[PDB]
């Protein structure tokens, strides 16, 4: 099953216009099997939306007794988004995260 | 580890005054190892309080992207309280529940 790590880096400009981000999903001992894809911020928005709806899902019972440096911030944002899904079973085993890769 | 079931029954009046309830914790195949104790409604109130504080404990992060028949009702109430703790790891593995028996 390994352990999951994530790194979003290396922003490249596509000939069509939009910038692309390199997404690295590391499966780690100290030897790692890596899975690399390329995504744009729109896909990150979609994933964020799906996860955010998946997230904040709790409580169903009671108790009772009786200078285009914005791509850097986008990079770090997507990175935080991916890293936030590590220690939550609902997000880590989410089908949207698996279809994402 | 077995599977947990609970039955609160057989209300008896203690010579000192207070009524006592028979609490059966069943550890179940179809053959069950039983653990029986006797409790009063005060202990049930204490347990209920500890569990209720233990319960309703969620959310610590963000997301981001940019005719004294009242003893019957008391019996059923305590029974519901015990049965409610089965399918929750935080309540099932609670030390208050283990000290209770």
Residue numbers in the entry:
A (entry chain A), B (entry chain A): 8 to 35, 40 to 77, 89 to 123
What's the paper's own text on this?
The Phox homology (PX) domain was first identified in the NADPH phagocyte oxidase complex subunits p40phox and p47phox, and has since been found in proteins in every eukaryotic species from yeast to human. An extended sequence traverses the protein between helices α1 and α2, termed the PPK loop as it generally contains a conserved ΨPxxPxK motif (Ψ = large aliphatic amino acids V, I, L, and M).
Last, we observe an unusual domain-swapped structure and membrane-binding activity of the SNX15 PX domain. Interestingly, our binding data are similar to that shown previously for the isolated SNX15 PX domain; in contrast, however, the full-length SNX15 protein bound relatively strongly to PtdIns3P24. Further work will be needed to clarify the functional oligomeric state and membrane binding of this protein.
